[PDB]
Design an enzyme around this catalytic site. Sequence first.
Site, mmCIF file in Angstrom:
data_model
loop_
_atom_site.group_PDB
_atom_site.id
_atom_site.type_symbol
_atom_site.label_atom_id
_atom_site.label_comp_id
_atom_site.label_asym_id
_atom_site.label_seq_id
_atom_site.Cartn_x
_atom_site.Cartn_y
_atom_site.Cartn_z
ATOM 1 N N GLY A 263 37.861 40.141 41.073
ATOM 2 C CA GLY A 263 37.333 41.305 39.980
ATOM 3 C C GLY A 263 37.055 41.137 38.398
ATOM 4 O O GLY A 263 37.180 41.762 37.786
ATOM 5 N N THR B 169 41.297 39.807 43.812
ATOM 6 C CA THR B 169 42.292 39.692 42.557
ATOM 7 C C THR B 169 41.606 39.122 41.457
ATOM 8 O O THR B 169 40.129 39.268 41.475
ATOM 9 C CB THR B 169 42.534 37.830 42.924
ATOM 10 O OG1 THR B 169 43.290 37.187 44.375
ATOM 11 C CG2 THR B 169 43.399 37.158 41.894
ATOM 12 N N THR B 170 42.019 39.852 40.295
ATOM 13 C CA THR B 170 41.791 39.709 38.863
ATOM 14 C C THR B 170 42.715 38.721 38.013
ATOM 15 O O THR B 170 44.003 39.328 37.901
ATOM 16 C CB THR B 170 41.888 41.165 38.309
ATOM 17 O OG1 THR B 170 41.423 42.107 39.606
ATOM 18 C CG2 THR B 170 41.049 40.686 36.596
#
Lengths: 229, 244
Positions: A131, A1-2
């Site tokens: 991320g 996940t970003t």
Amino acid sequence: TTILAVSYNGGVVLAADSRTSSGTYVVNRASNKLTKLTKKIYCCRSGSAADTQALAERVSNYLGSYQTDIGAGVNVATAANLFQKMCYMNRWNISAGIIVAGYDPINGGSVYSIPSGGSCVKLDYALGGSGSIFLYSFFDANYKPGMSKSECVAFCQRAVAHAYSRDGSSGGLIRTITLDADEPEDQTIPWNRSPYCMEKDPKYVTQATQNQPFSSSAKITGNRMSSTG
Amino acid sequence: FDKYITVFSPEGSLYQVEYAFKAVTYPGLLTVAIRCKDAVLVVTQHLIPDRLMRPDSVTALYEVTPNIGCCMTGRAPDGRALVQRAREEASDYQYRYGVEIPIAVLAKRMGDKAQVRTQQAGLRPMGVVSTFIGMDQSDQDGSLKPQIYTVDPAGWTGGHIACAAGKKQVEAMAFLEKRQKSTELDALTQKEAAMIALAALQSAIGTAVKAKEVEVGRCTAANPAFQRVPNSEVEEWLTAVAEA
């Protein structure tokens, strides 16, 4: 996940990858991690999809009840302090790393990191999820506050890209959304047209010289690419 | 003894509930709602006799959810309290079923709440007539079709093409019924429908009203959110009633 919110003058930009992995397999390729709480107050969601969705709906519901009874808009603060209380009460059970960003007319463009513990830190810009770790240096270098709405979007995309290009967990589409005085502008940059990727970057065209033919000379040439050579 | 608790009289009537319907008449405020083709109005009387009372503050009509507007008539404070039950109800729904409460349900859930107070002794029936108005998505085509639903202190939910509640609700219904024979009333433009509502308000109390002495609620197929109407647009209807 970003995920990442940044504030520009008028308002904010949230931005996200679109990949939810069960570790190494990509369960969903096109998740909306930007989750509307009110008209102008979106939250980003890192960590267990279950837990952030359940909290985003539980808060989106209290903000709806609140917004009705006070007969006025919700302050972003109110969204973040509600989200802090719920992330904090259950901090042991859940695995939730939230960014509430938004616009209210009083303060304008507000961004709150609510990481795991249930801290709640009003900032110029917040980074969340696996991320994130990549961006911190990228921001310290290339971020330059007092950006126009246009640049902040074009920037956040560039950022979310640089992150998802290095992180495995992160990847796919770069959803943004701009929350200001005007009507919310979501846009969804598909990977095939992303601002940065390692694949298309001329830095990484020329391959590492690992294979290397059987030669009569320590002089490294290139890789072996034909059996005939 | 029949009269002071919620129990049947010898003639099978809960006297406390007949006596709450009297608590709707008592304040001397009359509301008229009217469905048209594409929208709902709810017109309420808004009488502030004190020159010192801030007009802004005192409302009959609250928002319940963005798509459903109330309009309480009776003991203001019982109204105020039902609206809170109705919001609690509509938030409970929104969470458990993940969609907006359909107005027809909201009304019917408030029906069952007001019934409970006519059954359990020692609760006073809420001396008020809820008049919920809102668009309701017909599942055939997808069209937003306008709705009115009255709850009353008995717990009797009902839908309405138009309706009145309060001081002169008999004479205001008599006026709307006589004007249902001429026209269709569901083939009317928002303007025409308003003129009938504001003429019923006028006919009933017996006086020409100002754009200050009424507040008007509204939902349209175009703008399904429950809006208060500005006093500018109400004055274009009260000038258009005085003409014809």
